[model samples]
Target: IKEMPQPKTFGELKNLPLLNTDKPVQALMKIADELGEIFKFEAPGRVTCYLSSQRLIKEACDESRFDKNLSQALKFVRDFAGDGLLTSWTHEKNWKKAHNILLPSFSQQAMKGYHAMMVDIAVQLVQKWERLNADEHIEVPEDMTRLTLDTIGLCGFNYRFNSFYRDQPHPFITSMVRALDEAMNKLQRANPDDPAYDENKRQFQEDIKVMNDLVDKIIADRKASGEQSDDLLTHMLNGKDPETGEPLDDENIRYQIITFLIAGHESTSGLLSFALYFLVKNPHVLQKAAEEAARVLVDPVPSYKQVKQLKYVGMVLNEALRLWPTAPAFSLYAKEDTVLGGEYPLEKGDELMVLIPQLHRDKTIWGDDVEEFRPERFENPSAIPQHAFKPFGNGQRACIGQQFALHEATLVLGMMLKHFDFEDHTNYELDIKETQLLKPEGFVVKAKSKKIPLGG
Candidate 1:
C-alpha cells in the first residue's frame, strides 16, 4: 500500500486551506476529494489523522482500542464545565458514575414531563414574533438562543431566566456566555504568557465564579422548597452511585448543572436556527412539513405522543443535522498498539479525528445531490447506515439529552409551522459563525401568521 500522506510540518497543517474558510465543512470535503479519505497532519506533539470514509469512521467509534480521553482541546472545556460528561476523561470514575445517574432523566417518560414547558416557551417566542411589525426583521440566531436558554433554565433546573420577558439578559446568561467565549479564546491562543490569553483566563475564572454562585443559590432554593419536582436538578440531587451508594458532592452537582445548561441549549438552538434557514430556502419542503404538522399535531400544544408521530418533521430536522451538525467533529485515541481497518498500523497514542460533516455528506453513502435539502430520504431509515449520520454523536458517549433536544425542536417547529409562515427578509447565504459550536452569524427572517384573514 502507498504511504499515508502527512503534512510536512505543524505550520503546513495549520495553513491548510481546510482551516482557512468560514465554511469548514465544505473546506474539509474539498480536501477529502483532493486526497483520499485517510490522511495525516503532524502537529506539535501529535500525529492527527482525519477519517471520512464510513467504514473507518464506524471502526473508530466501535472498537475498544480507541478511547475518548485523548482530546487536548477538551482541557479548556473542562476548565469551565469541570468533569461533566462532555469534558470528563474516559478513565475518570466520576464520568461513569454521573452518566449512570443522569441517563434516566432523559428517557421518553422524563422528556414527556417537559413537553408542556417547551411548548409554553415556543409559544412565547411565537407571540413575540407576532408582536413585531411585518416590516420589522427578526434576528433568528439570537432569538433561537434566548428560547433554548429559557427552555433549559426551566426544564433543567426549574429556574426562570425570563429570557423572553426581560429585555436585558439575566446575569446567569451574561456570565455563561462570557465564560464560554473566554474558554474558547484560551484554546486558540498559542502562548500562555500572552497578555490577551491571561486576560481571557482571568475573565473566565471570574465568570465561572458568577455561574457557580448563581447555581449554588438555585440548589439551595430547591432544598429549602421541600417540594418534589421532576426537573433535572431534582434527579441529579436525588441520584447516587449504584455501586458506592453515595450522592454527588455539591461541586460535582454544580458541574453537571453547568454542562446541561450549556450543551443542551447550544446544539438545540443551532438546529432550530438552521432548520428555519433551510425551510425558507426550500418552500416545497416547508409546505410539506407544515402539512404534516397540521395533520398530526392538531392540538395547539402537542403532547409527547403527537410530536413523536410527526415523521416528516423528524426527517426535515435530520436532513438539517446532516448538513450542519452542531458538534461537527469528534476524536478517538489508540489505547494500545492496533491496526486501523486491519491494514494501517497505529501506536498506543495515535489519534483519529472523525470528520462528521464529510461523513454525513459522503457521496458513496448519501448518493448524488448529497448537498441538497431533501428530507424524504429519511422516510426510509435502514437506507442509511447507523454510523453514517451522527449529529448528537456516536457510541456510548453520545448525548444524554438527545431525546430531549429532538423532542423540544420538533414540537417547537411543528407548532410554529402550523400557525405561522417563515420567509427570508433578507436574501442571505449562511455565513457560519465559528465558536465551540457552529452558529449562523446574521440569520434574519420574517414571520407572518397564517391564521390571519387573507381576503374579504
Candidate 2:
C-alpha cells in the first residue's frame, strides 16, 4: 500500500478529515476552541481527508472533485457511500428539477392551501400520542416519525400509506422500512477485503432497485388512473417547467417526491422529538414553549398566521436540531481539484463533509456554552457565524423542502403543545442509531392530555 502524501504545511493540508460520527465532531469543537482550527486527517485516495473551520464550504464541496476516482473508507471499504436510493433521495439535481416544476406549486401562496390539512394532522397526532401513552415508556422519536410520515403522506404525496393509522402493518411501510434496513446493512457490513463484499454490493443494488420499483408502481398507478388529488405528485404531474412549458418527466419528478417525503418526515420528527425531550426534561423551557403554542393557537385550530407567530416554538426546534442533528455528519464528495481560502489545495475526489455537530458547537461561532440547550440563542441568529446553524444542511444542495417542513413542524408542534403535557421518560438511554439518517434506538416518552383539551 502506498503511504499517504502529507501536505507540507497546515496551509497546504485542508482540515477535512472524515469524522466517524457527530460525537467526535462535537469533541473536535472543543479542540477548535482551543486549537483555533482542527487539523486535516490524511487518507489515501481522497485529496484532503478533513478541513478546518477556516475552510469555506464551497472549497470543501469542491464540486469538480466529484468526478475523480478517490477511494473512501465509506465508498471503497464499507461500500456505503455509493449512489443509491439514499443519494437519490437527496437527489440535488432532481430537487432543482422538481423545484422548477413544483416550486411554483409549492410557493407561499400554495402552502397556504394546506393550512387546514396541517392543523388536522396536528390534531390527529395529539390524539395518537394519547393512545400510545398507555405504556409509560413511549418512544418519542419513532412515534414522531410515524406522525410526520402520515402527515407527509396526506399532505405532500396525498396517499394514505397509513403508517400511523395502519389497520394492520401496511406493506408499503413494511417494504419501505425493510428496503432501508437492507441498504444500511450492506453499507455497514461491506469490507473491500471480504470475499462477500461483491455479494453485499449486489444485494444493496437489488434493494435499491426494489425501492425504485415500488415508487414506480405508485407513480404508474396514479398516472394511468388519473387519480387526481392535491398532493406533491399531482402538483408535479400538472406543473410545467416555466422555461420549457413541459411537465417534469416521470423519473425526475418521482425521485424527488419520494425522497422529499422520506427526508422531510424522518428528519423533522426526529428533531421535534429530541427538542420535546429536552423541553420536557426542563419544565421551564417546556412551559415557555407550551405557553407560546397556546398563545399562538388562539383559534381552536392553529392557522398559518398563528403558526408563523410561534417564534419561540421555532427557536426550541432550532435548538433541538443543534443538540441532536439528525444528519450529524453527512458528506458530499468533491467533484474536482479546487483551491479554497486562498491557501488549501483540494485535489480531485475529496469529500467535504461539514460536520453539523462540530459546526453547531464551534466556540467561535456558537460561544463557549454551545452544549447547553438554549433556545434564546436564535433570537439574534447573527450571533452565530454563517453556515454554522445548518440543521437542514447548507449550500446549493440544502433541503428544498425546508419551508414546507417548517410549516408542517410548526403546526403539529404547536398543536401538541396546546393539547398535551409531555413527561420525560428516563428509561431508554439516548442512543441514536445512524442509518441512512440518524434514528432513535427506540424513542420513548410519556404524554398526557393538557387541562384544556379541545374536544373534552
Candidate 3:
C-alpha cells in the first residue's frame, strides 16, 4: 500500500480555510496548488481524499469500483429528503432502479413539451422587468430563483408557485430554502456543542415538514384526479421498474418530487445568476451572445429547434458553468480494495471528492488563460480535453435534466438579450456563498430594455 500525501497534523487541517466562511473555493484552490493532485486528511471519524488531477478524477468517475455513497453532506440532505435519487447510496439498489424509471421523463421530446411553458414564464419575467424603471436594480440571485422556481413548478410538477406575482415567497419555497440553509450551516459547523445547532435542528424539522406536506398534497391531488398527464409527476407515479414491475411508493414519490422541486430549480437558477454576472463583466462577449440570439431566435418565442441554433449562447452558458458550477463537488465510494491513479490503494469504504471547480480550471487541461472568462474557448473543438469539463457531471451519474436546463436557460437568456441590456450595479468582481448550492452573494444589476424607452 502506497501512502498518500496529506496534511502533517490536525492543526494544519484546522487552519486550512476550507472552514473559512466567506471564500471556501479560494481555500480549496490553494490546497490544490500546495498539495499536488491528490491529498488526504484524517478528521475525527472520517478520512477524505481530494483529487484535482483530471486523469485521476476521470478514472475515479469511470470505474465501477467507485460508486455513489452518501457523504456527510448528502446524509444531511437525505435526512430531510428521505433518500431520493441524489441522496440514495449505490448499495441500496434504489438508485439504479429509480434512475432507470425516471430517465425517459427528461428525454428531448419531453423537453419540447416544456419549451412553451418555459418561454411563457420567461416572458413574464421580461414583462416584469419592462414595467420597472430602467435604472432600478434587481437582485440577480433572488430574481433568477423566482424564475426557475416558477418554471420548474409549471413544467415539471404541474403546480404553480406564482412566485413572481406574490409579495412574499411561497410557503414551499420558504421552507425549502430554510431547510437547505440549515443543512449547510450544520455541515460547516465543526463544533457539536454549538448552541445554534439545537434551534437549527428544531427549525429544520419544521421546514422539512412543510416541504413534505406540500409534496404529499400535490401527489394526493394528482391521485384524486384519476387522470394522468405527461409531466414528471405523472411519469414517476406511473413509471414501472422493468425488472421488478414495481411502482415507486408514495413516500418515495414524495421524495422524488421534493428532489425535483429543490434540486431541479436551484441549480439552474444559480447557473443563470452567475452567468448574468459574467455577462455584465465581459461586454464584448455579451454583445456576441446578443447577436447570436437575434440572428437565430427569429420567432417571438424560441422553440426547441431554434434554441439549439444559438451556438454562441450555448458556449457562453458552458463557459459560465465551467467557472462556477452550481454543484461544485461530487463524491464516489470505493467498492473494494483497489488502486487509483495507478498509485493509491483504497479501502472498501474510502471516499473520493471529485473537486470539479478545481478540475475545470486545471492549467494542464485549460491552458494559460484558465482564469480568464473566455467563452470562445469552447468554440474550438480541440481546445478542451474530454472528461475535463463537467458542469453537469459525467457518465451514468450525470444530470438527467442536463438538456432540459440548457434549453430552458438558453431560451430565457437568448430572449432576454434580444430585448434588454444588463448594466452592472455593483461594478465589483464575483464573490460567492457556497452552501447546499453555489450562488452569487450581494450581486445586483440594472436590466435596461433595448426596445422600450426609459421614459415610456
Candidate 4:
C-alpha cells in the first residue's frame, strides 16, 4: 500500500491550527496545497484522512462503499442535534424516520407552497435595503443571514423571527449560534478537569436547554392550535413514512427543528453572502445578473414560475459555491475494510473528510484558471465530472434542502439585483469566518436604490 502524504515539519506532525475552532477548513486547504490531493492530517486527539481530487472524491461519493462519518465539529454537535437529519449519523433511526416524512415537503411541489412565503421575506430584505441611504454601506453577510433565517422560520414552521424588524439576531438564532460555537470548542479543548472547560460546558448546556425549550414550545403551540399549515412543522407532525407508516415522535421532532434551523439557514446564508460578494466584486457579472433579474422580474415580486427563469443568477450561485462552499467539508467512512484510490489502506471506522473547496478547485477538473469566478463554468453542467461540483454535498446523505436553498437564494439575488445598485466602497477582500459554517467576516456593500416601482 502507498503511504499517504503528510506534513512532518512539526514534532509528531502535531498541527495546533488544525485543532483550532477558527478557520479549520482554511487550515486544511493550505496543507492540501503542499501535499497534493490525498493527505493525512494528524491532530492531537485524532488522525484525519482527507480526499481532495476529482477522482478520489467521486469514489467517496459512492454510497455503497462510503457513508457519512460525523468526525469533525459535528461529533460534538451531535449532543444538541444528533437525532436530526443533518447531524445524525447515517445509521441513526431518527434520520431515516424524519427523512422519509420530510422528503416530500422539500420537493418541487413543496417549493411552490413555500414561494409566497419566500417572497414575503425577500421583499422585507429589499425594503430594508431601500430604506438605507445611497452612501450607507450594508454588511452583506449580516443581511443575508437575516433573510435566510427569517425565510426558514416562516416556511418551515409558520414561525416568524421577523429578523428584518430588528438589528440583532432573533434570540433563538443567537442561542443556536452560541451553542454551536461551544460545541465546536468542546471538540478543540474541553476537559472536565480544566477550569475553562467548566464555564464553556455550562454555557453549552444552558444554550441547549434554551433551544430545546423553544422548539418544544413551537411543537406544543402548533398542536394546540390544530393548525394544518403547509409548513415543515405541520408535515413533521402529520407526515408518515411511505413504506413503514410511522410518524415522528415529539423528541425526534425537537431534534428535527434544531436541525432544520441550523442546517437550513447557516449554509444557505453563506451561499447568498458569497454569491452577493461575487456579484458586487465583479461588476460585469453583476450587470448580467441584474439584467436577467430586470428582464424576468418586471413585477415588484416575481411569481414562483418567474423566479425559476433567473437561470444566470443560478449559475452565479454555482460559481460562488465553487469558490466558497459554506459547509466546506463532510466526513465519510467505508462500508467495510477497503483500499481508497486503489492504494491507501482503510479500516472500517477510519474517517475520510472530503475537502469540498479543494475538490471544487482542482485544476485537473476545473482547468488552469480555477481561481477565477466564471458563472459559465456551470453553463454546461453535464460536461463537469461526477461529484466535482457538489456544493450541496453527495448522494443519500446530501442536503435535503438543496432546492429550498437554491430557490430562496435565487429569489433573494434576483430581487436585490432588481431593486438596488451595489457598490463596495470599502473594496472588501475575503476574510472568511468559519465555525460550523463559513461566511465573509467583514463583507460590506452599498446598495443605492433603483427605486423601481413597487406595484403588482
Candidate 5:
C-alpha cells in the first residue's frame, strides 16, 4: 500500500498549519491544495487526520469505513451541553430521543408552524434597522445574532427574547458564548499552573450558573403561561421516544435547549453575515438576488410559500456557504481497521476530520474559478458530485435544523435585500474568526432603507 501524504517529521509539522495561526483552516487548505488527498494533523490529546481528496473523502464517507466521532470540541462540551444533539454520542438514548422528538419540528412542512414567528423577528430586525441613524454602521454577525437569537426563542418556545428591543444582548447569549469559548478552549490550551486558569474556572462555572438560571425561567414561563403551540419546546414537553417510551427529563430537556440556542443561531448567524458580505461586495449578484426578492417578496415579510420561491437568494446563500461552511469541519472515525482509498492504512480507533472548505473548492469538481463567489454554480447542483458540498455536515449527524435554518435565513436575506440597500462600509476585508463554529470577525456594513427616504 502507498503512504498517504502527511507531515511526519517534526520540521514538517511546524511547516504545516497545525501550529499557532489565526486562519488555521485556510492554512490547512494551502497544504491540501498541494499535498495528497489525505493529510495528518495533531492536537493536544488528539492525533487524528484529515480526508482531503475526492476519492479518499468519498471512501471515508462510506458507512463501512467511517462513523461519527465525538472526540474533539464535541466531546469536551458535553460537560456543559450534556448529550444534546450537537454534543450527543450516537449510541446515547437521549441523542435519539431529542433527535427523533425534534426532527419533525424542523421539517419543511413544520417550518410553516414557525413561519409567522420568524416573520415576527424579521420585522423587529427591519424596524431596528429602519430606525438606525444614517451613519451608524451595523456589525454584521453581531447584529444578525439579534435576529437569530430572538427567532429561536419565539420559534422554539413562543417566547420572545425581544433582543432588538434591548440595548444589550440577552444574558443567556453572553454567558453561553463566554462558557462555550472557555470550555472549547480547553481542547487547544490548558494549564492549571497558568495565570488565567483559575479565573477561567470560576468564570466558566459562573457563566453556566447564569445560563441555567435563565433557561429554568424560560421553561417555567412557558408552563406558567399555559400556552399551547406545535413547536420544539412543546414537542419536548409533550413527546416521547418510541423505543424507550419515556419523555425526556427536565435536565435532559434543559441541555437540548442550551444546545439548540447555541446551534440554532450561531451557524445561521455566520451564514447570514457571510451572505450579506458577499452580496454587497458583488453588486451584480446583489442586484440579481434583490431583483428575485423584489418579485417574490411583495409583503413586508414574504409569505412562507413565496420564501420558497426566492431561488436566487437561496443560490446566493448556497454560494456563501461554499466560500465558508459555517460548521467548517466535522469529526469521523473508522469502525474497523481498513486501508482508506485502498492505499492509506488506518486503525479502528483513529479519528478523522472531514475538511469541508477543501471539498467545496476542489478544482477538479468546481472548475478554475474555485475562489470566485458566483451563485450560478448552485443553479445546476445535480451535475455536482454527491457528498461533495455539505456545509450543514454529513450523515445522521448532519444539522437537524437544516430546513429550519434555510427558511429563516432565506426569508431574512430576501427581506433585507428587498427593503434595504447595503453598502460595504470601509470595504472590510473578510476575516473569519474560528470559534466552535465560524464568523466574519469585525465585518461592518451600512444599510439604507430602499423603501424609506433618508432621515425619514
Candidate 6:
C-alpha cells in the first residue's frame, strides 16, 4: 500500500483536523454526529485536544475559560467572543471590576446619548456618497470603513477622529488606521494552519502593544477630563457593576470601550455593506426597505421613535445579519473534562471553534434555498430552531451590544433609505473576505436622489 502522509506538528494537525465546517452549523452538526461521542487526538508539545464537545463549550464560555492568554482575554473582555486576549482578565479579579464598571456606561440611556453623534456622522457619510454618486465611481468598501470609524469615534470615544473626512493628517486617525491594519494583518497571519504562524504571532503581540498603549492614554484622558457626555466612558465612571459593586479603572474601562467600539462599528458596517450589496443584487428588498422608511418617516427628519416603525428596514437589517454576520468565527476552550452533546470528549486546553459562516448557511436549518438572500426569512424566522440561528451568538455571552448595534444600524439605514435610492453600481455579487471582523470583502454601490418623499 502507498504510504499515507502524516501531519508532523501541532500546526500540521490543526490543518488536518476536519472539525470546522465549510458552513458553520453543518460543521457543528457533523462533529456532533460523526464524533458520536467525545474524541481526543494527540497534539504537539505534550498537548492533547478534545473535539466536538458542546457541554465543555458552554462551561468554557460561561467562565470565559476560552480566553487562555492575555491577548485572547483582552479580546473577550471587549466582546464576549473576543478574537484573542481571552485568559488575561477572565481569570483575574479585575474581570469583575472591569465588567461591572462598564455596565452603566452601556446602559440604555447612555447609548441613547451616542445616537446624535452616530446620526451626524452618518449624515456626513450620506453627503459624501452623494458627491461620489455625482462623480465617476466610488469604492464602497473602503469608503464605508472610514465612515463607520468616524461615526464610531463620535459615538463612543467622543474624539474628533475624522478618519473619513479630514483633509490633512491627524495623529489619532493615523493610529486608528494603523491599529485596524495591524489587527487585520494578525488575523490573516494567525489562522490555525497558516505557514508563517510564528511571525504572525510576534506581529500580533507587537501591534497589540501599540493599541494597548494608545487606548490606555485615551481612557486616562477620559477619566481625568471630567468631560461629560452620555458616551460610555462618562457612564462607566459614574457606574458600578451591579454584581460586584466595583468600578472599572482606566485599563479595564479602555478594553470595554474598545471592545464595544470595534464590535459595533465593524458588525454594522458589514451589515450596511452587505445590505447595499444585496439591495443592488435584489432591488425589490431595497425598494421595500425604502418604501417602509418613507411610510414611517412622514416628516422630513426621522425621530428615534419614527425610525422604530420602519419594520421592513429592520427586516432588511436582520436579513443582512443573518446572511453576513459581522463575526463569523467564534471559539471556546475547555476548562474541565466534559462531554459534548453526549459524545465529543473535551479536555482542558482543547478549544471548540464555531464557524458562523458555515452555520448560517446550513441547509438543515435554513432549508434548500439557503443561498438565496430573502429578507422574508426573518418575517417568519420561527421556522429555524433557536440554537440554529445565532448571528450574534447564543446564551449568556450573546452580544450585549445587540440592542445598541441594532438601533444604530436601523436609524442610519432608515435615514439613508429615506433620503436617497441606492443604485446598483457593482455587479450583484457580494465581494466578501475575512478581515479582523466579517466585513465587506469589497463593497461597491451608488446612492442617487430619489423622487420618493423622505417621510419615513
Best by lDDT: 4
Model 4 TM-score, all chains together: 0.96
The 10-residue segment of model 1 with minimum total lDDT is 8-17
- The number of the candidate with the highest TM-score is 4
- What tens digits encode model 6's per-residue C-alpha lDDT throughout 115-198? 677667767766666566375565666666666767666666676667665665355445444556555444223365567566
Ranking by TM-score: 4, 5, 1, 3, 2, 6
lDDT of 5 by residue, 215-317 (tens): 7787877778877785678888888886678888888888888888888788999999999989888999999999998888775456889999999999999
lDDT for each residue of candidate 4 in 1-456, tens digit (9 for 90 to 100) = 899897763676386545444677888888898889998877666787888898988888889889998766776777889678988877877788888888889887789999989988888888888887655778887888888888888988888898888867778888898987777666545465678577777878888888888889999999999979968898888888886899999888888878888897879989999998888889999999999999999776799999889999999999999999999988898888988889898888788999999998899988899889999998888888878888788887898999999999998898988988888888898899987789988998887888897645
- Pairs that clash in candidate 5: none
Clashes of 6: 26
TM-score of each: 0.94, 0.80, 0.93, 0.96, 0.94, 0.76
The C-alpha stretches of model 5 lying farther than 4 A from their native spots are 11-18, 43-45, 193-195, 221-226, 452-456
Q: Give one clash count per candidate, in the order shown.
A: 0, 21, 0, 0, 0, 26
Whole-model Cα lDDT of every candidate shown, in order: 0.81, 0.63, 0.81, 0.85, 0.82, 0.59
Candidate 3 whole-model C-alpha lDDT, 0 to 1: 0.81
Off by over 4 Å in 4: 13-21, 190-192
Give me the runs in candidate 1 sitting further than 4 Å from their true place.
Answer: 7-18, 21-26, 196-198, 452-456
Q: What TM-score, to 2 decimals, does candidate 1 have?
A: 0.94
Candidate number that wins on TM-score, 1 or 4: 4
Q: Candidate 6, which segments miss by more than 4 Å at Cα? A: 1-89, 107-110, 167-170, 183-225, 380-384, 451-456
